[PDB]
Design a protein around this nucleic acid. Sequence first.
RNA 1: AGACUCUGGCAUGCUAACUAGUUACGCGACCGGUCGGCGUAACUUCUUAGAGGGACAAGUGGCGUUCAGCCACCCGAGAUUGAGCAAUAACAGGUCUGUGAUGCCCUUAGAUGUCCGGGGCUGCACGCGCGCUACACUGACUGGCUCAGCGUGUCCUACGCCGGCAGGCGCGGGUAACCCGUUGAACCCCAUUCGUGAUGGGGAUCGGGGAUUGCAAUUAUUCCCC
Lengths: 189, 61, 72, 67, 122, 144
Amino acid sequence: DIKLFGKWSTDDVQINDISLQDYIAVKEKYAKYLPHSAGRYAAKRFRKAQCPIVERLTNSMMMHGRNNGKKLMTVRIVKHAFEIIHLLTGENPLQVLVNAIINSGPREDSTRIGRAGTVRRQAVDVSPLRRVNQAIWLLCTGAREAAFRNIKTIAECLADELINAAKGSSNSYAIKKKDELERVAKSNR
Amino acid sequence: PIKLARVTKVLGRTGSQGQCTQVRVEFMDDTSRSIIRNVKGPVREGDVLTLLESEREARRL
Amino acid sequence: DKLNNLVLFDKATYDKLCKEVPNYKLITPAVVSERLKIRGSLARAALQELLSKGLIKLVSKHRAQVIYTRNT
Amino acid sequence: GRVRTKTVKKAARVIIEKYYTRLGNDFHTNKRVCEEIAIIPSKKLRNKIAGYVTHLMKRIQRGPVRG
Amino acid sequence: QSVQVFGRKKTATAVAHCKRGNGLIKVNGRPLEMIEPRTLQYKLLEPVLLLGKERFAGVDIRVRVKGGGHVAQIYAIRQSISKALVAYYQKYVDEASKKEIKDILIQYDRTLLVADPRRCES
Amino acid sequence: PGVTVKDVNQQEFVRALAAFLKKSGKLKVPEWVDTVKLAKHKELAPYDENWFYTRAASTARHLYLRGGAGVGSMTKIYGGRQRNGVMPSHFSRGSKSVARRVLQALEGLKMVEKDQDGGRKLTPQGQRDLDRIAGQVAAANKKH
RNA sequence: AGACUCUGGCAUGCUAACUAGUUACGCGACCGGUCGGCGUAACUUCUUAGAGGGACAAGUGGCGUUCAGCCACCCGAGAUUGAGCAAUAACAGGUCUGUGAUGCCCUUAGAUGUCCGGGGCUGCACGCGCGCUACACUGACUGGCUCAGCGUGUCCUACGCCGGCAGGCGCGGGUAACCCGUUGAACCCCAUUCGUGAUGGGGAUCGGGGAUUGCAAUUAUUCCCC
């Protein structure tokens, strides 16, 4: 049976949301040994839904300027992060990650409708894939921002971020961002 | 109250820059209540949404 | 304000290291460096000492991130 | 997109008009017979001609053409 | 009695040499566990971990590697292992088994048999 | 008893070789060791007090793995990134003297052979020694 | 324009390769295995360079005046490769050592006379701009590990010795799929030290030496070390 990093279970992972049950891919067939797979996912549209969620996370963690190519680094970060999570909660880290993703992604968004000049945006519904992508982006950004100028490691910081977003507490950056977007989207209508 | 949704049909592209997708929403509450909504991001036929307000109806006529 | 960390131990520090530290669930040189106002070097050294004594379990040793566990 | 060439068309018409009996619906067979009938320099061109013939015969065996 | 295939990723070409042996997989004179990027070690061990050591029982594989970077090389190597095994099954064993193995491998990762068509564009 | 050098964790093997070199006692050590750099490209002196041994071991290993190497070749191996300041970085070869004195030292210990071919390869005795060290490391890995 | 041609993707089919490589077999070295150690029976998988194939909207489904065509999909290496040709339109932009006993203007006012020596092109309050290095912890340093390709070369350089270091000194190969050169690359990976501070990040600016290049380095040629 396939285990992530050769230690992490995937059959225990339970998706709470019915909306994201299709787009977070980790459960059975999509489960892989390593995050690094280096297959084309930007080949055609919606294909990055069929890409593993850990892999996606990895790919958004190397995003920044000086780190722009280094994928092995990213995967090491992810691994250590997972270990940290395990140490902390005792729960399966993949499950935690999934939870975080669920609780980080925005549900509604204010978007410019009319012309350039009319600054009254209309609050619109958010795609499930986009909600996943955006969530991932937010989490990675949080990880970055917590780990810039301190003794804290990115693996540690990322783990912290992910647990905070898993629990639903207002200590995560991602959660805060969601709250800020969501309230705005409740204001515009 | 939070209501879940379906996608019956993807109609076209609304919005200023062509960012919003106009989509036919069937409810997952068993009712055949077909409300047309606007979504941000990529939506294909067979997606399931999480609408914050269900009472709302997007730009019809 | 600036951060002032102890480069070498104090009695209060030493006691809070031999008693309190081997019961943190997650023990990280960075976390120990943040909890008790210690420089990362000294904290690392302490961790190593604790490993050598046999009070604290080891998870993974790396060039960057070394992770430790409380015993039972 | 993609559109048929005049030359390809005319040659195809010639080939059908003269030697309908030899040709069929198998593309490859039609190609090969074409190669053995007409003076063709290019391979690509020949292939195109064959394709046109094949399409034409798919169409023609249902009902007669205008051309 | 012996098979010689290639796997190509990017520039990196790995030639695998499959023969009736005792179950040895050596890449450029060293074991699969003894290759430097041990963060990407699992990727190289995938054809072994998927099909089991039971299918790799009496087969000796020597992998000759050349070109590319590190990751690319790894990818080539793994490919050529899988392809090598498949070819051996085709040639000197039955077809059904080959079909099965191939099915398994495609069902896990598509890259493992068919090569990535893209390489460094001008 | 059948193990080989290539089938062993490389770093660990190197370490063990270095240790062996140390515990033997006999090796020609230059007097500038606590003063020298190791390349024009590097910034500081090496951290290790007994770095010379280590480097010798490494050289030996390289000779074993790939023969017909000279001093130039050895310099090309141990080269790296020159931090050219505000100018962009380039590749620069190692310290010729250091390599030269490693090779002379190992050759003195009857571990390295000067060649008809051109450069330098390995002695049979040296090879034997290497394989003994590989065995040692192997035993201390499969049983550990 | 398209068409024509090339090119690239594909071949465990074919043609070959003493300047390509593999396999097997001998001998040797090492612990029944490892060897870019060496010596000819296997012929092309890798490498090369050729011929012949191979994709034509071929097939299926949908849409279409039921045609021209368009969209989707299976198999496939490839279903929409890139270039040149292809030798347009307007030019009142023209171009060139072609001919006119060509029209003028100039020729101690040489339509830049040749040479000689030394300077300048870098000069610096400032604007407007392309870049390089950075602003560190996903880091820096230190040691160890392992992988290219486009290319070049009668100055590219192998190898020994003297050198802390740039470099010297000796001796060879290459007018080149042969030697540099299994191009031994860097990132990266693996361990070591540092610990959020103008910090060992960052290196500007400067002060002393030394070494080349060259007729000449003073306004630092460039490199090296503090």
